[PDB]
């Protein structure tokens, strides 16, 4: 026989003897005798009853990215987890072992948790009560220290919180026995009345009190197991960290970055490919590759290719030579301004109107008219409402004339689609209808070349064309991706 005084185990808060483990039916008669003989070691037995001894493991915190992690209170302050769910998850920790410090891998008492700022100030008293799920509730009538189930019956704790604690414990192994400081399986806990039949029954009914927790992001009622199925296990510490989406990922639009959430709202990105990108399964550059013509549109008529001298040159520079009339040059430049940037085909630069003027890409005779056309990408100021509207809406409210407005619209459609002036990206023609940046009774008009729609000019054949008709007559520089209009003489 071995030293029976050394046959002790480490429970949640107390030491646990081998005899207590046998009484609590955690070990069998065979295991117990082998401990008293030496056939089995204390460490060998403890390795097989770990979820009953210290719990299977609760949600220790959050993890936005696979490397760096956050605690429940940190993720709340970074707005990754709602304040409401933050309390409930902290209640679960205190009821299944204690408040977890994920950055030091420890089980802390509520006192120690306050000392390390792991718990906020307002949620202080609520977690003290949840801690008693393991310590026990002092009944002022009987004089006994009772479990949560009895604390609910004795009205020592509200039913709501009590159901959360019981749910969290069961998902961690079973029902906690406070006096023994050890987890008991559900079947044996029912037999000795450690948990009431009625409470346990309402704990298995999805229409009663089965789900007592709430989602971190949304406000949907969820179970503790469902949240655990959404957790990552840290390789080093073995902790259970809830996978939260920090998001905040965007692609550069015309003037400003466009959130990935906006892209799925505009129908640019399928939701299946977004969180697949958030998880890191696919690459960032490949996603932005597909939606290239939605972020900042297709290439416009960027310049002119003089076939006589075999030279690439900007539109404004072509006018100085006499390759194009000032009338033709102006509408082509404002078409560029209405699509985002003024382009220099030889230097492959894409600049706003102001910066284009500073570098000689645009003269002073076109500066004002081009600044006005640039409002088609940033918005038109409505003199009545005081806020910015779109190109299409500015046309209907007679802020700009129809002829000028039509040529700018078809310029946007020919280079990706209608420009959203508040999100700074190209919309699908169906989304533009919903937000009112275009009209279905106008898409068919601009589709087929009509009398009113041919507001552009081809210097080669001297005929009036739509922007699409003229763009189809252009060629492409393989190293710039720009459309150049071939010219002779």
Author numbering: 1960 to 2448
Sentences from the paper on this structure:
Desmosomes are intercellular junctions that confer structural integrity to tissues by linking the intermediate filament cytoskeletons of adjacent cells. The cytosolic armadillo proteins plakoglobin and plakophilins interact with desmosomal cadherins and with desmoplakin (DP), a member of the plakin family of cytolinkers. The 912 amino acid C-terminal region (DPCT) binds to intermediate filaments (IFs), including keratins, vimentin and desmin. DPCT contains three plakin repeat domains (PRDs), designated PRD-A, PRD-B, and PRD-C, which share ~30% sequence identity with each other.
We determined the crystal structure of PRD-AB consisting of residues 1960–2248 at 2.6 Å resolution. There is one copy in the asymmetric unit, consistent with size exclusion chromatography indicating that it is a monomer in solution. The two domains are arranged in a “beads on a string” manner to form an elongated structure with approximate overall molecular dimensions 38 Å × 42 Å × 108 Å. Domain B is related to domain A by a 54 Å translation along a common long axis of the two domains, and a rotation of 29°. The two domains are connected by a 4 amino acid linker (residues 2204–2207) but do not form any direct contacts (interatomic distance < 4 Å) with one another. In fact, the amino acids comprising the linker have higher temperature factors than nearby residues and do not form direct contacts with either domain. Although the overall structure of PRD-A is similar to that of PRD-B, it has a markedly different surface charge profile. Whereas domains B and C are acidic proteins (calculated pIs ~ 4.7 and 5.8), domain A is highly basic (pI ~9.0). Superposition of the three domains of DPCT shows that their overall structures are very similar. The principal difference among PRDs A, B and C is the presence of an additional N-terminal PR-like motif in PRD-A and –B that protrudes from the globular domain formed by the 4.5 PRs (grey in Fig 2). The envelope clearly showed that there are two domains but, in contrast to linear arrangement of domains A and B in the crystal structure, the SAXS envelope revealed a bent conformation.
